[PDB]
Design a protein around this ligand. Structure first.
Ligand SMILES: CCCCCCCCCCCCCCCC(=O)OC[C@H](COP(=O)([O-])OCC[N+](C)(C)C)OC(=O)CCCCCCCCCCCCCCC
Ligand SMILES: CCCCCCCCCCCCCCCC(=O)OC[C@H](COP(=O)([O-])OCC[N+](C)(C)C)OC(=O)CCCCCCCCCCCCCCC
Ligand SMILES: CCCCCCCCCCCCCCCC(=O)OC[C@H](COP(=O)([O-])OCC[N+](C)(C)C)OC(=O)CCCCCCCCCCCCCCC
Ligand SMILES: CCCCCCCCCCCCCCCC(=O)OC[C@H](COP(=O)([O-])OCC[N+](C)(C)C)OC(=O)CCCCCCCCCCCCCCC
Ligand SMILES: CCCCCCCCCCCCCCCC(=O)OC[C@H](COP(=O)([O-])OCC[N+](C)(C)C)OC(=O)CCCCCCCCCCCCCCC
Ligand SMILES: CCCCCCCCCCCCCCCC(=O)OC[C@H](COP(=O)([O-])OCC[N+](C)(C)C)OC(=O)CCCCCCCCCCCCCCC
Ligand SMILES: CCCCCCCCCCCCCCCC(=O)OC[C@H](COP(=O)([O-])OCC[N+](C)(C)C)OC(=O)CCCCCCCCCCCCCCC
Ligand SMILES: CCCCCCCCCCCCCCCC(=O)OC[C@H](COP(=O)([O-])OCC[N+](C)(C)C)OC(=O)CCCCCCCCCCCCCCC
Ligand SMILES: [K+]
Ligand SMILES: [K+]
Ligand SMILES: [K+]
Ligand SMILES: [K+]
Ligand SMILES: [Zn+2]
Ligand SMILES: [Zn+2]
Ligand SMILES: [Zn+2]
Ligand SMILES: [Zn+2]
Lengths: 396, 396, 396, 396
């Protein structure tokens, strides 16, 4: 009586019907019921129910039945154990929190990593470079032209290319060389050609507009074409903000680097580590505030009485200056523009440096481990072939 | 004779009665006794004792019986093995020290992470914000007002808001703008209202006073109300310390940040890593002392004989200055306010930098791993539901 | 019917013939075929096929048959599981990507770590030092002479050894002491003797010339012998580049350090971490470009209007200067030669420091783990004896 | 025929006699011999040999017999597997190098962590403090006096305590205050009393003299007693070196800190990581040399032709100065005393910073992991009780 032998994949597990009867509604519970001969596959010769499943984890499932706490067997990948407990009817939200973060690890990484006749050829200039030959050619050319645009920008901000002429009308200002403007015009011509080509075919235009890359491209090409458009009074304000917009022209490099792997992995890491980033920012804000206040008060202890101002010989004339020093000191950067100059200030400074090392090394390893797991997974999915589907599943 | 077969969860383990007889007092030992048929469940058909336990670890328990040294099977979470050896009667303080720190890991993290009718509504303003709607409103409002207080403080210490008027009576000093004092008064009104509301209901007033948060709040609200109270001779000394007390007014931010998770995890990490913090401080103190002495003596080797003082061209005029330089250099901060200027000094400086990297990277990874484990456990306990108790335990 | 029992190494596995029939062409599939009695070893007494293999992993192989996804059992080294699935006929390119990077780990490290009578004695001066006594003597002597050459170089570039004489013909320049030239001549004599000795025996001269070490040695000995060779007009240009060539004379130290272990491990690590190095360089290039642009624009917000130039009080007069500052700040180096001096600049600076910590700590741990695995493997292969071949394989 | 069933701890392993016959001389080989019934325990009823050993690893041992390569089962602590293969007769130097460094890990850490009536009371003042009450009192007192000595030293080197009097005979020099000399005398009296007490009982005087602590103590107490001893001509030279000896007086703090745990763990870590320290020093030496040469040559590219010296506007006037800069820059210290000032110099500087991060992060993690393992083991051995010997071994 009350002695039932479960045969899982050729391994016999024996236990009392009561242990099965503990957790109701599950398949093993239904085994415990007297109406079990018809319900499940069973042979009267050996009085054992036979299940064609992995036994090595059914050990742990039956253990959960026995003691009452479900654990993750640390010798199997999380998804395998997940699929087994899914078969057995066990809810996967019962595992102990001590063994949940390692269980839900592979699956976590997996989820985090996740006219008309010539239209295919039109769109083939925006598809992946390796997906064709025209695609790779257009990609190389757009790369060259983005780099030329960026170099034109960086050299336009230079002094050697911005001499000031003795021109009065009586204001004299630096002017840019004509060659820079001409190269900029050429690059604008090329980008406008590419943008019109992409606009030709825009399926699901809502998601096309939601695409940040196209937004950045259009915003980057917007200021130049405003040369013809430029009331002169509003025009000066819009030119003033137009320089600041032209600042975005360096963001066109992400269009090129999007096809890199490490950058997609970095995007997934960032989007998947919001909590740790907020944690790091909170830690840094508390540290900066506290240590700025402490150093501002410490450096006044040795202040000379003669001076009318509270602090004359110290860089820490107020607290916000303390914020700047505290960041520079906690990140172990240490420019040396401002540093403590009193024994009390030096004590506070050493404390700030150590606390900075600690509260920077708290969340950063979490973020780094996330990136490491996602990068390893992406490199795996890259090295392995796409799909072959060698397994031919049996009919139900 | 002396050949006994133990059936654990449907897996047969065979061994001689002597091996069981080694460790006395334990349940398996009692099995070895001839009065075992009545004592334990047993069938004469197969001459095997049947125990309804996980077999995969009973392997290791019987191995401890065989050889004499108990180890932790590295394929099961620590608590599972703990519970099994608890059932078998084995003392859990016998495992080898080589396998103790990994065994007692999940359990370690677990332990480290651990009138009257309107009184519930009164206290609901101090309860968690998400626990109600009034609670969340009061929390947002107290957040806004704490931030306004802190900004008032930081701007009061500024120069632009502390001009010195040409007022004599004949001493001229900077005075704060009236708007700052008025905003401070408003914030004091709000905090005093909140403090009276919390004082209304104070169960277990001993633990309420032992609560550091309420202490900080009351100490922070103490200086302002002393405006009316302010002998003028004692009053000047108490105002002088009152500024230093007002320095704590920034500590009211912990009241807000207490509901964050990362901060509670950080508190548990700190309170659980006292030994490693003391170790780090000892390492740094030895390093600082030794390297300060070494650099002070090194920089005098090349000292010019003409100068009457021992050191005129070196920043290292004595040893404590060496302490400051040694900290700044060992933490790789390197302000550049003081640095070696002699070949001997440069050798000592390079040694200090390397030794600093090493003796800072010794204990810090221990602390960081503690924080990582506790944070993963807290995030697990957050993601999983609270409790369902699906398991229905069998009657004893 | 359709119930087949596979006996692997004395452990019975039971499953239906359909599960075997899923994946065709494999050995277990052939078992499922009715012509299996003759094909494989089998006894009619127990109706079980017997395979003399490790059972602990055949569990996982049969599980792959059952569910359809192949995983790596995390309790066995990768090569053992590889060899088992090789025996069973399973393709090793089917394992899930979630468990591929840990599977292909030991094997990855393994692959990454991988006249005539007196000619043996001639070549024995270039063989390993420990491989003979003459070898060790010649190695010590060449070490002493390489070190003397390097010290001669470093002292020749010094000022104390380059006084300028009052010599006109009317140009006065610093000249090197005669002792330096004589020591250089002696070292050249020794290196030319060693080079002729090595040239005596040069098997597979194509690979001898492809050897970078011999290239470096010959290029290093080339400039001195050009003293006799030195048209005077071309001679001045070749001397000018000859100083730059003599710069390589410090590269002769790699000849000595090649016999060290850590350096060979470092070479394997570098050659095996090209992807992560390119990733790090891409991350740094994007960060440097973006933050240089941001700081250059930020520091102009507070620019004084009086000055004709856009920036007079800021170190960031253009963007490339921004590149230099951005590198120095992202690596937490922080010289202090140039730093932000405006509240906007300070915000951008703090962001640059944090982003630098993050995008430097992303790929560097990958590279460090590669080096750690390869170094542990090399130290293992060093500590273990070379080979004994105690196993005597059975005849097929 | 040739089918033998080994029963290990109640688990049947089946294999052919040939597989056992492969590796000769081992116990399983002797099983394969026809004279096996008498040699080993065996029952003719089941034709199985019974061994009372852990089966879970005998799987791997028999696998070594089968394939020919021995691996470490990653689910058991190294010592358990070691003891099993020791029983089976397998040599423990056969495991593959891929699985040797993790196998020999716990054992590695274990090895690395390893008149007359009143003489016990005499020596009880040098024994551990907690080992008695007199011991703890003497320890606290010696701690106070060592700290007083160290503070006296550090203040004696100060300026405020070394005024120069207007004393001629006509040389004026700073003199130390009398209170410092008196406190030094008191501390010398106490240390000499303690040293005589320890000298009273010195068993195995060779090892007592080999003890570095007693050496340091005696050398530290040597200079003061030379006050009476101080030819005046030799006396000045010995006083000059006596100041340098007195420099060691700070080394008396190790006597106190020896009873700390982290310091003993650090000593074991250092003594056990000689190879990685030499590796780090080699890496740093190569990096420093190469980058110093590179920066010295880079900074001359933009050198102004007017100046007679090769370099006037650069800090890098020669190569050794380059060594100093290269260390300060590779350790990310970055004082800012010397930095590149030419675009070529800036490129070399960025390369130096990155290469420094890499070649410092190569061996340091190895050293840190060693310290982590040893510290965890020491904390384990501290938390667990000393010894109980509950296991009563069976007679052979
Ligand atoms: C100030 C810095 C702000 C940077 C702006 C980020 C620009 C951006 O969005 O880059 C995204 C690309 C990935 O772009 P994607 O691979 O094509 O997928 C996302 C967009 N779709 C096409 C699906 C609609 O690449 C990335 O995800 C890189 C993110 C790393 C930036 C940090
Ligand atoms: C190892 C043990 C470390 C314990 C160190 C405790 C020191 C506490 C000192 C308190 C008493 C000092 C005092 O009263 O005045 C002594 C002098 C005063 O001189 P000062 O004005 O403060 O020096 C400023 C530096 N100038 C720019 C002038 C050169 O001040 C000085 O000469 C300079 C004092 C330097 C103290 C800096 C300590 C920095 C961190 C050390 C702690 C690290 C431990 C981790
Ligand atoms: C100088 C810095 C000194 C900082 C003072 C620390 C103030 C503090 O105590 O914060 C504690 C809170 C956690 O506060 P709690 O979650 O409410 O629990 C503790 C108090 N009870 C209510 C149980 C009585 O939050 C924390 O534990 C944060 C600790 C991190 C500070 C480092
Ligand atoms: C790689 C191999 C590294 C081994 C280096 C060993 C060098 C030991 C030098 C001993 C002999 C030097 C000597 O007698 O005098 C040479 C000159 C003297 O000049 P100085 O007064 O010492 O230079 C001071 C710098 N000012 C500010 C003047 C520009 O001094 C100089 O010109 C500057 C000497 C610079 C030495 C600094 C070494 C810093 C660390 C290097 C070791 C790192 C290894 C890890
Ligand atoms: C600017 C720095 C450029 C450094 C030049 C590298 C010189 C070099 O090639 O060193 C290689 C040696 C290993 O040399 P090896 O052990 O004899 O094997 C390689 C050459 N064979 C003989 C097989 C043909 O040693 C190394 O691999 C050290 C590489 C680490 C350098 C970074
Ligand atoms: C913790 C919470 C952090 C939030 C901090 C937000 C501050 C934003 C300030 C915006 C409004 C400031 C303003 O309008 O002017 C105030 C003054 C202007 O003075 P200034 O010209 O900018 O100061 C230059 C420094 N000299 C060389 C003159 C001494 O500027 C100043 O007096 C100095 C302002 C210093 C701000 C530097 C912030 C650096 C990073 C802090 C953020 C770290 C968080 C992670
Ligand atoms: C320049 C710095 C040179 C430092 C000198 C080291 C002084 C020393 O030897 O300290 C050793 C003590 C451990 O001393 P111990 O525990 O008594 O054992 C060693 C000596 N016996 C008694 C067995 C003979 O403590 C240590 O091992 C600390 C070593 C860490 C120093 C780095
Ligand atoms: C992102 C992409 C990075 C690629 C950067 C490549 C730049 C290579 C520059 C080669 C051509 C430059 C040239 O011919 O002269 C331009 C000027 C000359 O001026 P200079 O004398 O060299 O500047 C010295 C600085 N003072 C003190 C005067 C202010 O020089 C300058 O104005 C300053 C040039 C600053 C270049 C420093 C680069 C530092 C590292 C960047 C690479 C990091 C990538 C990892
Ligand atoms: K610095
Ligand atoms: K740093
Ligand atoms: K730094
Ligand atoms: K600096
Ligand atoms: Zn668990
Ligand atoms: Zn163990
Ligand atoms: Zn997997
Ligand atoms: Zn292995």
């Amino acid at each position: 009586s009350e002695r039932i032998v479960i045969n899982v994949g050729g391994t016999r597990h024996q236990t009392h019907r009561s242990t099965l009867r503990t957790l109701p509604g599950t398949r093993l519970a239904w085994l415990a019921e007297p109406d079990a001969h018809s319900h499940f596959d069973y042979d009267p010769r050996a009085d054992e129910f036979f299940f064609d499943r992995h036994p090595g984890v059914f050990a742990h499932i039956l253990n959960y039945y026995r003691t009452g706490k479900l654990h993750c067997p640390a010798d199997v990948c999380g998804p395998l154990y997940e699929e087994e407990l899914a078969f057995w009817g066990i809810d996967e939200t019962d595992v102990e929190p001590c063994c949940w973060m390692t269980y839900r690890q592979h699956r976590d990484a997996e989820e985090a990593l996740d006219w008309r006749r010539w239209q295919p050829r039109i769109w083939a200039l925006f598809e992946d470079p390796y997906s064709s030959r025209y695609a790779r050619y257009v990609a190389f050319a757009s790369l060259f032209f983005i780099l030329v645009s960026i170099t034109t920008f960086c050299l336009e901000t230079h002094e050697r290319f911005n001499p000031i002429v003795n021109k009065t009308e009586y204001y004299r200002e630096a002017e840019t060389e004509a060659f820079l403007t001409y190269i900029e015009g050429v690059c604008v011509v090329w980008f406008t050609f590419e943008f019109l080509m992409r606009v030709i075919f825009c399926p699901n235009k809502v998601e096309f507009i939601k695409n940040s890359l196209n937004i950045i491209d259009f915003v980057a090409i917007l200021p130049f074409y405003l040369e013809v458009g430029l009331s002169s009074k509003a025009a000066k304000d819009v030119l003033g903000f137009l320089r600041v917009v032209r600042f975005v022209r360096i963001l066109r490099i992400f269009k090129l680097t999007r096809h890199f792997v490490g950058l997609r992995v970095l995007g997934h890491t960032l989007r998947a580590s919001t909590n740790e980033f907020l944690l790091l920012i909170i830690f840094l804000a508390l540290g900066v505030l506290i240590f700025a206040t402490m150093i501002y008060y410490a450096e006044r202890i040795g202040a000379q009485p003669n001076d009318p101002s509270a602090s004359e010989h110290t860089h820490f004339k107020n607290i916000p200056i303390g914020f700047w020093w505290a960041v520079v000191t906690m990140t172990t950067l240490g420019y040396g523009d401002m540093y403590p100059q009193t024994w009390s200030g030096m004590l506070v400074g050493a404390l700030c440096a150590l606390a900075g090392v600690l509260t920077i090394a708290m969340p950063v390893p979490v973020i780094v481990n996330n990136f490491g797991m996602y990068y390893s997974l992406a490199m795996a999915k890259q090295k392995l072939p796409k799909k072959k589907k060698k397994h031919i599943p049996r009919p139900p």
